Swiss-Prot record, chain D:
This is DNA-directed RNA polymerase subunit omega. Pfam families: RNA_pol_Rpb6. It is an enzyme of class 2 (transferase). It comes from Escherichia coli O157:H7. Its EC number is 2.7.7.6. HAMAP family: RNApol_bact_RpoZ (MF_00366). Promotes RNA polymerase assembly. Latches the N- and C-terminal regions of the beta' subunit thereby facilitating its interaction with the beta and alpha subunits. Gene3D superfamilies: 3.90.940.10. The lineage of its organism: Bacteria, Pseudomonadati, Pseudomonadota, Gammaproteobacteria, Enterobacterales. GO terms for cellular component: DNA-directed RNA polymerase complex. One of its GO terms (molecular function) is DNA-directed RNA polymerase activity. Keywords: DNA-directed RNA polymerase, Nucleotidyltransferase, Transcription, Transferase. The RNAP catalytic core consists of 2 alpha, 1 beta, 1 beta' and 1 omega subunit. When a sigma factor is associated with the core the holoenzyme is formed, which can initiate transcription.
Swiss-Prot record, chain F:
The chain holds residues 697 to 796 of 1342 of the full protein. It comes from the Bacteria. It comes from Escherichia coli O157:H7. Belongs to the RNA polymerase beta chain family. This is DNA-directed RNA polymerase subunit beta. DNA-dependent RNA polymerase catalyzes the transcription of DNA into RNA using the four ribonucleoside triphosphates as substrates.
């Protein structure tokens, strides 16, 4: 169903996109995963640590 | 201490009567003071800001 | 024990294991190079895998 | 300089006596009594001590000899 | 001229230590880190559900 | 909002305390960034009493862990509400879903 | 005066720190210090952050 | 041979108000990517824009407070002004001014229009006035520059600074948003393989696409002047 | 000060040999280490004016797989030796040479017929060791002005190391102006055939990347 949903939008089934390298400008061989992981921000803030 | 009586006499300064014990923002921290509150004990004359 | 403790650990061994491997039919299968230098140029220029 | 103290240990053996030799010589350079031998590459007195030690031009024997020489001159400041 | 897993790379460093001493082993440790990181990045060895 | 969630989060936000849920349905009448004022319906309204609900949102106030517990309105002026419905996002809520 | 100078963090204390830092090891440490290699002295690089 | 072929800016399509494509027809073999990446890099890094920088709403001391009649914290109004897409023709810092009263949204179309100041999205919303006799009045300060400048670095410099009324917004002076180039087979009539470059960009609305590509190339040539005729 | 990007100093060109060289710069704006270094290296390495030997027809056998008398250097090894013959040529476009030489020791770059235009940079180069007799060798060698580097497939044929560079590698690293803390510091590193040194290969590369942009730049 995840693949079916990814086909609903025109994204690719594998979920793996060809990313380029923003510095040298040349593709990373062997496609990489890209998605939106929902990321928390734990309050182990470093300026309560130093 | 000696050399301090010397310094004070040389530069005509009267030593302070009272000691600084202010509240100061802790090192490193910025901020915008969003609220102040003054708790005056019963029987002490409320200042301007109270 | 006399063995090293500055062993390359986890991304670096992935980087070496991915450099120093060999597909069976890439670009430049079986072309004679004049040294490491033009192996680096055949790679970066986009001529060999 | 300086990344390692390997060669300075190959010259002054035992690898702890290196520390003592370099620390004595760096105290000499730091407390205003003496002057580097090898050209300082903008080093603190510590790395200069170890650079001195690497060239074979300072160790514990040389330091004793120079100390006795300079303390005998102060005897020769008897007038 | 082999595959260079992890045993092989710790072996490489150990023999460089036992042949060339220390300074070449350290500078070679760094060059092996830098080139390992660079080509691992170039590979985009991403993981995915397929 | 959790872009990939599990549906337990609408309830983790409502059944907590942070979000400000309406008590009685009705239609919103005034939406400041520091209060909501619900014109309660004629049916849910009691027999004789002026039925309008007032919601004093809790603006920036220190929590225990020194963070900032806040409440913003998610409603709009003159929009229907219903009982058991959120009126104000709390700290880490987004239209009533727990956004951490 | 030097104290208040480094407290105001003028442009000369950062030069002076870059110079009294230069060839001076520091001793990093990690909490459970099992073996004797969990205290190794490094040479600092002054880094934002 | 001809010993090189130079690119010339040829088409500048306007697919929309925000984003638009440019094309650089005669590129040789390999220079497609060589310019494509460097220009993408320059464009995303260095392009002068005009983000608002300071705000001074009327009855407001600090940004953690809530004016009445307007259903946004002042914190959200600052984060709304931060996206204000504005151009100035002649000045560096201009002080726009936004008065408005009575129920309803407060777009950017309610700003006092000045001569050499244009707002690209008038539909951009600042805050929702929500009361009859409740108004807002605020002096916005759209200065102008390069890159990104947070307010912690902007706490600067000296005396005359500043009242306990002024808010600072984290300036984000950069009109480009997205870049995506494509070399492809350019068909010049007598030639085999010349590359075209299609630098499709995506602006907030305050850059002439031709002007962006020109300034990118200029910054690259200015930098590269040092490698040429080395010291 | 909106278009005033801080330009570097080229504060060092410390060079290891005549062909090796390690050029730095500092500082560049934060993010120009890569844009500069990468444009320069793709141009140095993929399109540079150069003349190098194209194809060969050895008098022994015209098949690359073959046998040749009195030589312990196979055909492919002779071709590897020929790719490194660093050759400077004047306006004469294509110049084919003769190397057939008699003796027993090393066949070198001194063994080439000394034509009017062609110029060799390492006469001490080696092309093939030979046996103990009069000789066994005769080859027609073809240098051809080209650009970049073009393998034998696209063309006995030989890969063409036209471009003088044999290596380029930039390594951006954190420079430091007094106040600003994050500024690049490119550290170029370049080796050439000897048909030109690094100190001028970088000049020629930047000149290419500037003339490529004459259609846009202002002032």
């Amino acid at each position: 169903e995840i693949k079916e949903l990814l086909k609903l939008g025109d994204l690719p089934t594998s979920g793996q996109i060809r990313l380029y390298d923003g510095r040298t400008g040349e593709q990373f061989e062997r496609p990489v995963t890209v998605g939106y992981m929902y990321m928390l921000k734990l309050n182990h803030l470093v300026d309560d640590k130093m | 201490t000696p050399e301090e009586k010397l310094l004070r006499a040389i530069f005509g300064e009267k030593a302070s009567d009272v000691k600084d014990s202010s509240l100061r923002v802790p090192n490193g921290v910025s901020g915008t003071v969003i609220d102040v509150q003054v708790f005056t004990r019963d029987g002490v004359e409320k200042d301007k800001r109270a | 024990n006399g063995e090293p403790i500055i062993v390359p650990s986890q991304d670096v061994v992935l980087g070496l294991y991915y450099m120093t491997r060999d597909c069976v039919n890439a670009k430049g299968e079986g072309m004679v190079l004049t040294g490491p230098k033009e192996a680096e140029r055949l790679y970066r220029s986009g001529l060999a895998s | 300089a300086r990344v390692t103290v390997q060669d300075a240990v190959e010259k002054i053996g035992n690898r702890f006596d290196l520390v003592l030799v370099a620390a004595r010589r760096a105290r000499q350079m730091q407390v205003g009594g003496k002057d580097p031998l090898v050209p300082e590459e903008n080093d603190k007195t510590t790395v200069i001590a170890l650079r001195e030690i690497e060239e074979g031009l300072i160790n514990n024997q040389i330091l004793d000899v120079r100390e006795r020489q300079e303390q005998q001159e102060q005897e020769a400041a008897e007038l | 001229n082999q595959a260079l897993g992890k045993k092989a790379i710790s072996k490489m460093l150990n023999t460089c230590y036992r042949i060339l001493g220390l300074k070449p082993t350290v500078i070679f440790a760094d060059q092996i880190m830098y080139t390992g990181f660079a080509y691992a990045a170039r590979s985009g060895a991403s993981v995915g559900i397929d | 909002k959790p872009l990939v969630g599990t549906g337990m989060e609408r309830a983790v936000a409502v059944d907590s305390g942070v979000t400000a849920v309406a008590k009685r349905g009705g239609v919103v009448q005034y939406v400041d960034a520091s209060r909501i004022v619900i014109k309660v319906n004629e049916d849910e309204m009691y027999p004789g009493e002026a039925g309008i609900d007032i919601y004093n949102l809790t603006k920036y106030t220190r929590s225990n862990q020194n963070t900032c517990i806040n409440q913003m309105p998610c409603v709009s002026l003159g929009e229907p509400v219903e009982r058991g419905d959120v009126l104000a996002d709390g700290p880490s809520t987004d239209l009533g879903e727990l956004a951490l | 005066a030097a104290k208040k100078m480094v407290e105001r963090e003028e442009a000369v204390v950062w030069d002076i720190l870059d110079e009294v830092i230069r060839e001076h090891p520091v001793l990093l440490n990690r909490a459970p210090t099992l073996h004797r290699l969990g205290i190794q002295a490094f040479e600092p690089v002054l880094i934002e952050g | 041979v001809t010993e090189f072929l130079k690119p010339r800016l040829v088409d500048i399509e306007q697919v929309s108000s925000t984003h638009a494509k440019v094309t650089l027809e005669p590129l040789e073999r390999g220079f497609g990517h060589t310019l494509g990446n460097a220009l993408r890099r320059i464009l995303l890094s260095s392009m002068p824009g005009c983000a608002v920088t300071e705000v001074e709403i009327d009855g407001v001391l600090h940004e953690y407070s809530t004016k009445e009649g307007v259903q946004e914290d002042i914190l959200e109004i600052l984060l709304n002004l931060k996206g204000l897409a504005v151009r100035v023709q002649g000045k560096d810092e201009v002080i726009l001014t936004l008065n408005k009263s009575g129920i309803g949204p407060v777009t950017a179309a309610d700003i006092t229009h000045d001569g050499d100041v244009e707002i690209v999205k008038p539909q951009h919303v600042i805050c929702h006035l929500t009361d009859e006799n409740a108004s807002i009045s605020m002096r916005i300060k759209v200065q102008r520059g390069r890159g990104y400048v947070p307010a912690s670095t902007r706490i600067h410099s000296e005396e005359d600074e500043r009242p306990i009324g002024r808010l600072l917004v984290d300036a984000c002076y950069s009109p480009v948003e997205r870049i995506a180039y494509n070399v492809e087979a350019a068909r010049v009539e007598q030639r085999t393989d010349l590359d075209k470059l299609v630098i499709e960009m995506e602006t907030n609305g305050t850059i002439d696409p031709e002007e962006a590509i020109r300034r990118a190339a200029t910054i690259l040539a200015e930098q590269l002047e040092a490698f040429v005729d080395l010291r």
